[PDB]
């Protein structure tokens, strides 16, 4: 079903924490434009009829893959939300 | 069958109830024709149990 | 502990909907509110006009009975609307209770729009990780996403030209 | 079936005891045991002065045990919101947001899941 | 911004009735069949409740007035209760 | 296709006509069919005599004697066909002749009043209420008599009881409390019975002489000698026992109330109470119930027998005096005509009330015609019973067999007093008396299991809801062909021998034979049976007897198959089973699907819609032929033209076979060659795998008929014109709506196509094609204001009806099942190119998953598999009585015959065995299935006699390891009811009071979400998905449309608010004296209405 | 079974809602019985029979 689900499980303290993390990352990709990715360039989700999956046919796979990478850091309470969103909005013109 | 568990969850009086030992002693039955008189007898007293 | 300043429901809460041609369908609360107002009004009048003590106690009884009926119909007699139906108006108690009442209604919310139901057939080819779906249902279901994409494509000029494009099987 | 389930079932069904020694309140009162040892700690541990809340644990019909409930929301569920709320109002009632039902009517997230 | 963690049931003072009440309705005038606007300050007066038009009528559905009985009234429940709380 | 019938049982009598029950009930209900002077008085005349005689004798001026003489109604005002075209009800106007007398000289006699326009029973039995016809249903109850049961608490002593109906009326209860109490309760209050006996004319001395003659408790009535010396005074003391605040001086005031008409039951004098009286307790029944008022004194030939009974059963054994509650013999049945007549009597009683008031208000005697007569009350009452009574409903128009079964089946429930829903466990079990009386396999499974069943096929009601069944008289060692329809109670009196017993004619063929002494297996000599089972057929209802090999199948699914037999949809192609029971001819005979030639004659003309026949009598009559007629469910209705012009047809000769008859034979569904084998996954549990050919051939299809309708109204905002106008945008789709408002006929329809044009306030408001599927336009009806005989409802400016047809072929999702019970749904049709095929190119039609049969208990199905496989090469049919029919010996005989045929022609082809055959035969030897060393020819022949043979794959073409049994199985397509259609709506309408989505006619509609579903969601951590469901997909119009638009632009959906139903309930709480405050983590109010509640 | 009964279907919509549905409501994710620890994906009659037949001697 999902690659490295055991690995992500090990890196994730609770299954529901992994769920929340994945969903937060996916909605991040969505809201600020899909460019909110860290492993996109070289390896990337890719479609079948074309390479359309490089963009966002299904974000959740993107979040899972980035989680398989150590690129993202998810804190249950890691940063003040106001400044995190503010810096996301300054540094992402992908909108 | 099922009504067993039904009342098992609702604290009730089982119809076919079995007299339990009110005391922690020995048992001494009187085999009286009409109804037995089984007593939980211990070094202080015997508890009546009139068995139909 | 007793009632002397009875708040008056917000307007739409007991809706008056125009059925057609001029008839009005009103939530029965108003049918009782009106009577209450009349009650209190004549009470004021007689207290200004004169003190027929038997009479005064009469209007007091009608006032209190109207109050109670507004709180609950049927507890003392069965007040109903004007001639035409012997159906006691749904009181506050009636609205808040009953086998299909406010408690029954609020907690459940039995209706989902993006829902469907029909017969099934085995998917021996299908893996449990997937499901066997006749397209023609997902069609109506994802009309939103379908228009989204086919505007994402050149399929229709606009989302609504898309609506028109997709409203016909032909 | 693993016996865990029945463990929960019984531990929940028989979670009330009835006082026999009044402390702050009357002895003749049968309600949440955990409430009761918490009160005992309060009165003798937290409170000095050993006012004992003597009780006997209550064997209660599970139907009754549910009916013997705290929140007025669920209590007002079936029988009569009229009378239930009668008590809920006679005394300043403070129903904590505990239990899935009342949490649901409010539409608030059940504590479980996420 | 607070999340509700408790609910509280309590009785109401007629002063409290006013504490929320947006005026009082005093003559039960829903609407004239010609003029389908809330006829008076009656059971649907826009001002007592809120703007009928877009804050839209939600405030009407939430803002509530009161009605003052010259003769006080008794909550039917508190007596009709099988234990009549007042009578006890 | 010669018919090989195997069962050899001499049916002394044939099957009687099925549905008379509903005819006679109505037919017997109305004696008006014959001269009113005809003795038949049930129904009409009984109600007249009961309620017609309205007397005001002494009230001011009295002498009002309005007496009935003659009634009659003989006219259906409009034809049944018109009664459908217009929604008119087939009735007859009944005139009741009445003459008025008064204490004064002069007899005003207003003869005829059309009092009652009572619907007339259709030939089938249904009645035309409004355009369409309904059908009444009968029921069961306690036979009104005298019955005895030991005291529920007091086991040593029992009690007796008398049950008068209707319910209003005292319920006689008798018990003896030996402490000095003789307790009889009429409705509630006890009364020492002996006082009443003395009131009646009975003296204590004689009461003891002839009562205490044998018994001991007689002294319990001599004790009250204080009231035993005042006989007529005892009556006033009785009324003193009554404490209504009324004067005891009333000679027979309440005595009449306890006489014959009102409280005492009017059950037929002689058996309805007398049989219960004559037989159980008491001898003669002078008057149906206890009544004597001619001389002030009373006669009651029951209570003295009832007390003699109590004495006997309490003290001695004058008989086996104990009445069973659940035994069928004391449990009676109710007819439709009885309902006609009792609602009739209610109407007459109400009319008597009004005429009574009016006569006294009527100053002069010139008041008989109108001032005494007004038909409004009872007329509307009859309308209420035939329309507002829930008993009668739609008629089962699935298939003629379905209809007949529905029309000859009785239930227990009804008005409720007979028996309501919550207590049937004891009744649900099949009483012993059901034998030859009730088929216990025909009952509807489910909540109403044991509630409804078709009677024994041969069993019939003798007089009064009492089944008697044929039984072969058996005298000594000689059986008599004479058949006696025995009463259930009388049945216990003898020893009924089974029909399976061999005989040499009228004499048995076995000394030791089982018989039914009293519902037990009694293995006795032939001389110990008084009657022998006429046939297994009598044991069951009609629907039971249509599955051939019941002898090897379980009842659990026998009931399933018998039931599914009703849901069969007549097909385009009607086939008869390869193996039959033998009644299909009688089936299509009693069931009027096909046409039958009255007598000998010849064909004058046979046109697609008519047939003029010319009989040998020198006459000729033509009969129009039903080409396409819609059912209650929208199917075809045709009598297949079966006779050529100038074709000599004899009496009773089938003329045009009904919609589901092959050749005067039951023919629905089809016979298909089938092989049982576990295929990959398309025969999973009960899934059926079909080859393509049955679609290439026109082999499973039917026409479904859809009947839409709309109307224009005259709204006070403006009448809703039925027009062609769609104001706003497009005219292109309006071409289809050819005429203005109405559409052109004979066209295909796509979903969403305009059906009827119209505009509200102008605002476009018109009919369109319902989502789903519409076929081709066939018919229209246009009843505008020009109502010729139609009454368009108020506001309805006009009405219009539309008929579409869709030739529904069998498709992927369809469902099929066999007669022998096994059911299933088509799983897939496979391209016949690769599907398994015989050594002969001929492949099978269907492959089943065998795993079903073992769990099921039904071997008759596989037996039929063998039989049909044989008949395949034999090209001929068979008749198998359920148990007396074919035997496996003849099975193997036909197996050898058919194998010889098949492989002798194989040999003539120049080909014997193939290497594939030899290898498979070797492997069968390996499994021992074929004797090693036997010829591949001979061992293949034995395999054939095994009913299994070799097979080739088709995809890999390989032969199939393991021989497989196959055959021509007569499989039916069940009712593919509406649940089959997709109910899949995404967006559309919502409710008025609430915002829960609800579409329907416009859009499919939101699916029921239920509660336990939310419980499952709760099991998962489905927090925001459930939030979405209940807010974005349940109630929130604003949120749901916001998500709509977010999806439209494809962005992240918005945040649901606090549940607004929650806030509404908060406002409700505040509305009453209750005040509700939300609390913070610490005790502090937290506001839900951010600024919408705080004043200012 | 396949006796005629028809099933229903709905859909989670929100990205988080869909994520949660796929995560802990996937059948491929929901293998063992949580009621009791038995697996609820027990192989069916046809496959069981096939493997027993293949592995028999
Ligand atoms: Mg099923």
Q: Which of G6, F213, F1038, F621 is nearest to E58 (CA)?
A: F1038
A-D contacts (CB, under 8 Å): 4
Q: Which chains would you list as touching C if contact means 3+ CB atom pairs under 8 Å? A: D, E, F, G
Task: Could you please state the CATH topology (level 3) that the domain comprising F16-143+324-469+535-593 is classified under.
Answer: Rna Polymerase Beta Subunit; Chain: C,domain 2 (3.90.1100)
Cα separation, D91 vs D100, whole angstroms: 24
- CA-wise closest residue to C146 among A22, C155, D77: C155
Calpha distance F291→F266 (Å, rounded): 11
Q: How far is the CA of F686 from the centre of ligand 1 (A)?
A: 10
- Three-state DSSP class for F591? coil
- What's the residue count for chain C? 170
* F708 neighbors F767 (Cβ within 8 angstroms): yes
Tokens at C69, concatenated: 């009926």
The CA-based angle F92-F98-F101, given to 5 degrees, is 170
**DSSP-derived 3-state class of residue F546:** helix
Q: Do G22 and A60 touch (CB under 8 A)?
A: yes
- Residue F376 tokens read as 């409004």
Tell me, letter by letter, the H, E, C secondary structure of A58-83: CHHHHHHHHHHCCCCCCCCCCCCHHH
* CA distances, B3 to each of B6, D59, F883, F952 (Å): 4, 19, 42, 56
Secondary structure class of C95 (helix, strand, coil) = helix
Residue F442 CA to residue F451 CA, distance in Å, equals 10
Q: Which CATH number fits domain F1-6+668-700+810-974: 3.40.50.2000, 2.40.270.10, 1.20.120.450, 3.30.300.30?
A: 2.40.270.10
Q: Which helix (H) or strand (E) holds F602?
A: strand F601-607
At CB < 8 Å, which residues of chain D contact B?
9, 13, 59-64
The Cα–Cα gap between C146 and C138 comes to 10
Indicate the resolution in Å: 5.8
Interface of A with G (CB under 8 A): 1, 15-16, 18-19, 22-23, 26-27, 30, 59-60
CA of F687 to the centre of ligand 1 (A): 12
> F16-143+324-469+535-593 and F470-534 share one CATH topology?
no
The answer to whether the beta carbons of residues F776 and F804 sit under 8 Å apart is yes
Q: Which residue has the tokens 């021998």?
A: F497
Backbone angles phi, psi at F1076, to 5 degrees: -115, 125
What is the sign of the dihedral through the CA atoms of F728, F733, F738 and F744?
negative
Tell which of D109, D111, D112, D114 to mutate to test the A interface (max A CBs under 10 Å): D114
CA distances to C27, C29, F405 from E57, rounded to whole Å, are 17, 19, 61
Q: How far is CA F11 from CA A31, F16, F380, F877, in A?
A: 84, 13, 49, 21
Contact A1 G29 (CB under 8 A): yes
**N residues, chain E:** 88
Angle F104-F105-F110 from CA coordinates, rounded to 5°: 95
Regarding the domain with residue range A1-94, which homologous superfamily does it belong to in the CATH classification?
RNA polymerase subunit, RPB6/omega (3.90.940.10)
As given in the structure block, the two tokens for residue F513 are: 């034979």
G15-24 vs A15-31: helix crossing angle, rounded to 10 = 150
- Which CATH number describes the domain made up of F701-809? 2.40.50.150
| Contact across the interface for A16 and F1051, Cβ inside 8 Å | no
Q: How far apart are CA F132 and CA F386, in angstroms?
A: 12
Distance CA(C101)–CA(F433), nearest Å, equals: 49
Say how far apart CA B48 and CA B30 lie, in whole Å: 10
Q: Which residues of F689-710 are buried (b: 16+ CB within 10 A; e: fewer)?
A: bbbeebbeeebbbbbbbbebeb
C113 to F985: CB separation less than 8 angstroms, yes or no: yes
Nearest one of F929, F954, F725 to F832, comparing CA atoms:
F954
Q: CA–CA separation, A10 vs A13, rounded Å?
A: 7
Q: Angle, nearest 10°, between helix axes C135-152 and C159-166?
A: 150
C-alpha–C-alpha distance, residues D9 and D65, integer Å: 11
For the CA atoms of F557, F559, F561, F567, what is the dihedral angle to 10 degrees? -140
Q: Do F1070 and C121 touch (CB under 8 A)?
A: no
Q: Which CATH number does the domain F470-534 belong to among 2.30.150.10, 1.10.8.60, 3.40.50.300, 3.40.50.2000?
A: 2.30.150.10
Burial F442-462 (b: 16+ CB within 10 A, else e): bbbeeeeebbbbbbbbbbbbe
The answer to whether F154 touches F327, Cβ cutoff 8 Å, is no
DSSP code string of F62-88: --EEEEEEEEE----SS-HHHHHHS--
Kindly state the tokens that stand for F805: 């047809």
Residue F485, both tokens: 């329809």
SS3 category, F793: coil
**A16 neighbors D114 (Cβ within 8 angstroms):** yes
Q: Hey, which CATH number is domain F594-658, 2.40.30.10, 3.40.220.10, 2.40.50.100, 3.30.70.141? A: 2.40.50.100
| φ, ψ of residue F555 in degrees (nearest 5) | -65, -35
Are D62 and B11 within 8 A, CB to CB? yes
Rounded (10°) CA dihedral F248, F250, F251, F253 = -120
CB atoms within 10 A of CB C78: 12
Chains that touch B (3 or more CB pairs under 8 A): D
Burial class (CB in 10 A: 0-12, 13-18, 19+), F786: exposed
| Whole-angstrom distance, CA of residue F44 vs CA of residue F344 | 7
Q: How far apart are CA F759 and CA F749, in angstroms?
A: 21
What's phi and psi for F802, nearest 5 deg? -140, 140
Strand partners, F365: none
How distant is the alpha carbon of residue F590 from its chain centre? 18
From C123, C147, C108, C136, select the one nearest F983 (Cα to Cα): C136
Spans of all domains in chain F: 1-6+668-700+810-974, 16-143+324-469+535-593, 144-323, 470-534, 594-658, 701-809
CA dist F808 and F702 (Å) reads 5
The H or E element containing residue C70 is: helix C53-71
Structure tokens at F625: 């032929």
Q: How far apart are CA F980 and CA F997, in angstroms?
A: 22
- What is the three-state SS of C37-65? HHHHHHHHHHHHHCCCHHHHHHHHHHHHH
Separation of alpha carbons F168 and A86, rounded Å: 83
Q: Cis bond leading into F166, ω under 30°? A: yes
Token pair for G43 = 């192989």
What is the CATH code of the structural domain delimited by F144-323?
3.90.1110.10
Give the dihedral of Cα atoms F755, F757, F760, F762; nearest 10 deg.
140
């Amino acid at each position: 079903a999902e690659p490295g689900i055991d690995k992500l499980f090990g890196m994730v303290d609770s299954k529901y924490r992994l769920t929340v993390v994945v969903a937060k990352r996916a909605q991040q990709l969505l809201r600020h434009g899909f460019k909110n990715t860290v492993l996109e360039p070289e390896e990337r989700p890719k479609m079948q009829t074309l390479e359309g999956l490089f963009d966002d046919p299904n974000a959740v796979t993107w979040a899972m893959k980035e989680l398989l990478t150590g690129r993202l850091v998810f804190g249950e309470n890691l940063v003040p939300e106001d400044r995190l969103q503010k810096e996301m909005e300054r540094l992402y013109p992908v909108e | 069958g099922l009504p067993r568990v039904i009342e098992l969850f609702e604290a009730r009086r089982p119809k076919a109830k079995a007299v339990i030992s009110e005391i922690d002693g020995v048992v001494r039955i009187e085999e009286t024709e009409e109804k037995l008189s089984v007593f939980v007898e211990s070094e202080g007293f015997s508890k009546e149990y009139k068995l139909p | 502990m007793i009632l002397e300043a009875v708040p008056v429901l917000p307007p739409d809460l007991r809706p008056m909907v125009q059925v057609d041609g001029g008839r009005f369908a009103t939530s029965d609360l108003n049918d009782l509110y009106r009577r209450l107002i009349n009650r209190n009004n004549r009470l004021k009048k007689l207290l200004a006009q004169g003190a027929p003590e038997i009479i005064i106690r009469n209007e007091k009884r009608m006032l209190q009975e109207a109050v109670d009926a507004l709180l609950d119909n049927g507890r003392r007699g069965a007040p109903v609307t004007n001639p035409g139906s012997d159906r006691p108006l749904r009181s506050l108690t009636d609205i808040l209770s009953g086998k299909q009442g406010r408690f029954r209604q609020n907690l459940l919310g039995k209706r989902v729009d993006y829902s469907g139901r029909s017969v099934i057939v085995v998917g021996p080819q299908l893996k449990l990780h997937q499901c066997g779906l006749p397209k023609r249902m997902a069609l109506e279901l994802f009309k939103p996403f379908l228009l989204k994409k086919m505007e994402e494509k050149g399929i229709a000029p606009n989302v609504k030209a898309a609506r028109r494009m997709l409203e016909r099987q032909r | 079936l693993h016996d865990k389930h029945i463990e929960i079932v019984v531990r929940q069904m028989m979670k009330y005891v009835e006082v026999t020694d009044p402390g702050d309140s009357r002895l003749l009162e049968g309600q949440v045991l955990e409430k009761w040892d918490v009160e005992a700690l309060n009165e003798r541990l937290i409170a000095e002065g050993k006012t004992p809340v003597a009780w006997k644990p209550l064997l209660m019909g599970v139907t009754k045990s549910a009916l013997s409930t705290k929140s007025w929301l669920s209590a007002a569920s079936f029988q009569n919101t009229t009378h239930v709320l009668t008590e809920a109002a006679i005394a300043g009632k403070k129903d904590e947001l505990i239990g899935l039902k009342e949490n649901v009517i409010l539409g608030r997230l059940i504590p479980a899941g996420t | 911004k607070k999340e509700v963690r408790k609910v509280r049931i309590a009785l109401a003072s007629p002063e409290k009735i006013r504490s929320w009440s947006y005026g009082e309705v005093e003559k039960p005038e829903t609407i004239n069949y010609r003029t389908l606007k809330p006829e008076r300050d009656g059971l649907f007066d826009e001002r007592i409740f809120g703007p009928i038009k877009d804050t839209k009528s939600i405030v009407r559905r939430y803002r509530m007035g009161h009605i003052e009985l010259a003769t006080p009234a008794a909550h039917i429940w508190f007596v009709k209760d099988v234990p009549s709380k007042i009578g006890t | 296709m010669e018919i090989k019938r195997f069962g050899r049982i001499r049916e002394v009598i044939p099957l009687p006509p099925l549905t008379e029950i509903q005819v006679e009930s109505y037919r017997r209900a109305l004696q008006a069919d014959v001269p009113p002077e005809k003795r038949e008085n049930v129904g009409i005349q009984a109600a007249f005599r009961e309620t017609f005689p309205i007397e005001e004798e002494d009230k001011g001026k009295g002498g009002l004697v309005l007496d009935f003489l003659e009634y009659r109604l003989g006219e259906p005002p409009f034809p049944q066909d018109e009664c459908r075209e217009k929604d008119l009800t087939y009735q007859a106007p009944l005139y009741a002749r009445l003459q008025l007398i008064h204490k004064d000289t002069g007899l005003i006699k207003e003869d005829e009043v059309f009092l009652g326009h009572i619907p007339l029973m259709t030939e089938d039995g249904s009645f035309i209420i409004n355009g369409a016809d309904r059908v009444i249903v009968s029921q069961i109850h306690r036979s009104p008599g005298v019955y005895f049961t030991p005291d529920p608490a007091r086991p040593g002593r029992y009690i007796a009881s008398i049950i008068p109906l209707p319910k209003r009326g005292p319920w006689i209860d008798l018990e003896v409390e030996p402490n000095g109490v003789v307790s009889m309760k009429v409705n509630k209050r006890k009364f020492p019975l002996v006082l009443l006996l003395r009131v009646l004319g009975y003296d204590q001395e004689t009461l003891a002489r002839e009562l205490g003659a044998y018994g001991e408790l007689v002294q319990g009535l001599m004790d009250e000698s204080v009231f035993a010396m005042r006989p007529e005074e005892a009556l006033i003391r009785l009324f003193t026992l009554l404490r209504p605040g009324d004067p005891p001086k009333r000679d027979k005031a309440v005595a009449y109330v306890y006489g014959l008409i009102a409280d005492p039951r009017r059950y037929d004098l002689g058996e309805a109470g007398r049989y219960k009286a004559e037989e159980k307790l008491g001898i003669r029944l002078s008057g149906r119930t206890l009544a004597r008022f001619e001389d002030g004194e009373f006669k009651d030939e029951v209570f003295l027998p009832t007390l003699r009974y109590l004495f006997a059963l309490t003290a001695g054994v004058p008989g086996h005096e104990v009445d069973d509650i659940d035994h069928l013999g004391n449990r009676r049945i109710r007819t439709v005509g009885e309902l006609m007549t009792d609602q009739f009597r209610v109407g007459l009683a109400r009319l008597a009330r009004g005429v009574r008031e009016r006569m006294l208000m009527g100053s002069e005697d010139s008041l008989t015609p109108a001032k005494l007569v007004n038909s409004r009350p009872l007329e509307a009452a009859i309308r209420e019973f035939f329309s507002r009574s829930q008993l009668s409903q739609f008629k089962d128009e699935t298939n003629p067999l379905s209809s007949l079964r529905h029309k000859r089946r009785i239930s227990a429930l009804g008005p409720g007093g007979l028996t309501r829903e919550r207590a049937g466990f004891d009744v649900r079990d099949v009483h012993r008396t059901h034998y030859g009386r009730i088929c216990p396999v025909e009952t509807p499974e489910g909540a109403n299991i044991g509630l409804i069943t078709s009677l024994a096929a041969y069993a019939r009601v003798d007089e009064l809801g009492f089944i008697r069944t044929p039984y072969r008289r058996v005298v000594g060692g000689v059986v008599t062909d004479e058949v006696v329809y025995m009463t259930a109670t009388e049945e216990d009196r003898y020893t009924i021998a089974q029909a399976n017993t061999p005989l040499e004619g009228n004499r048995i063929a076995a000394e030791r034979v089982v018989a039914r002494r009293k519902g037990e297996p009694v293995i006795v000599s032939p001389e110990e049976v008084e009657f022998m089972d006429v046939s297994p057929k009598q044991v069951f209802s009609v629907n039971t007897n249509l599955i051939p090999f019941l002898e090897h199948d379980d009842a659990n699914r026998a009931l399933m198959g018998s039931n599914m037999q009703t849901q069969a949809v007549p097909l385009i192609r009607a086939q008869a089973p390869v193996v039959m029971t033998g009644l299909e001819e009688r089936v299509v005979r009693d069931s009027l699907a096909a046409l039958y030639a009255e007598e000998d004659g010849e064909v004058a003309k046979v046109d697609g819609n008519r047939i003029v026949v010319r009989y040998e009598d020198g006459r000729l009559v033509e009969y129009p032929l039903r080409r396409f007629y819609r059912s209650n469910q929208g199917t075809a209705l045709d009598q297949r033209p079966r006779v050529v012009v100038g074709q000599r047809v004899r009496k009773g000769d089938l003329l045009a076979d009904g919609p589901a008859s092959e050749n005067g034979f039951l023919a629905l569904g089809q016979n298909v060659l089938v092989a049982i084998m576990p295929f990959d996954g398309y025969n999973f549990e009960d899934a059926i795998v079909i080859s393509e050919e049955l679609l290439k051939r026109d082999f499973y299809t039917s026409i479904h008929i859809e009947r839409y309708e709309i109307e224009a109204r005259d709204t006070k905002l403006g009448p809703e014109r039925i027009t062609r106008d769609i104001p706003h945008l497009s005219e292109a789709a309006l071409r289809d709506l050819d005429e203005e408002g109405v559409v052109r006929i004979g066209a295909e329809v796509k979903p969403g196509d305009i059906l009827v044009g119209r505009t509200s306030f102008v605002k476009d408001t018109s009919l369109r094609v319902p989502p789903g599927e519409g076929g081709i336009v066939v018919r229209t009806v246009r009843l505008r204001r020009g109502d010729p005989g139609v009454e368009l409802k108020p506001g309805v400016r006009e009405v219009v009806r539309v008929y579409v047809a869709q030739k529904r072929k069998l498709q992927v999702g369809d469902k099929l099942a066999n007669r022998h019970g096994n059911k299933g749904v088509v799983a897939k049709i496979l391209p016949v190119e690769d599907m398994p095929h015989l050594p002969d190119g001929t492949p099978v039609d269907v492959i089943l998953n065998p795993l079903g049969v073992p769990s099921r208990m039904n071997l008759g199905q596989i037996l039929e598999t063998h039989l049909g496989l044989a008949g395949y090469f034999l090209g001929q049919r068979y008749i198998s009585p359920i148990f007396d029919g074919a035997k496996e010996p003849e099975i193997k005989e036909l197996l050898a015959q058919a194998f010889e045929v098949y492989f002798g022609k194989r040999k003539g082809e120049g080909f014997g065995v193939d290497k594939r055959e030899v290898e498979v035969l070797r492997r069968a030897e390996k499994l021992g299935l074929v004797t090693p060393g036997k010829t591949p020819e001979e061992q293949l022949k034995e395999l054939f006699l095994q009913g299994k043979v070799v097979l080739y794959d088709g995809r890999t073409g390989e032969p199939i390891e393991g021989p497989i049994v196959v055959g021509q199985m007569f499989i039916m397509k069940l009712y593919h009811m509406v649940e089959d259609k997709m109910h899949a709506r995404s967006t559309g309408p919502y409710s008025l009071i609430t915002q829960q989505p609800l579409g329907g006619k416009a859009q499919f509609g939101g699916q029921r979400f239920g509660e336990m579903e939310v419980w499952a969601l709760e099991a998962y951590g489905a927090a925001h998905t459930l939030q979405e469901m209940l807010t974005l997909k349940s109630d929130d119009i604003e949120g749901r449309n916001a998500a709509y638009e977010a999806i439209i632009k494809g962005e992240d959906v918005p945040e649901p608010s606090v549940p607004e139903s929650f806030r509404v309930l908060v406002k409700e709480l505040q509305a009453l004296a209750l005040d509700v405050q939300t609390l913070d983590e610490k005790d502090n109010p937290v506001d839900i209405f951010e600024g919408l509640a705080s004043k200012r | 079974d396949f006796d005629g009964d028809q099933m229903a279907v709905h859909v989670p919509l929100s990205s988080f809602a869909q994520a949660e549905a796929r995560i802990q409501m996937l059948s491929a994710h929901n293998l063992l019985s949580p009621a009791s620890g038995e697996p609820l994906a027990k192989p069916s009659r046809d496959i069981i029979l096939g493997l027993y037949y293949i592995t028999q001697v």
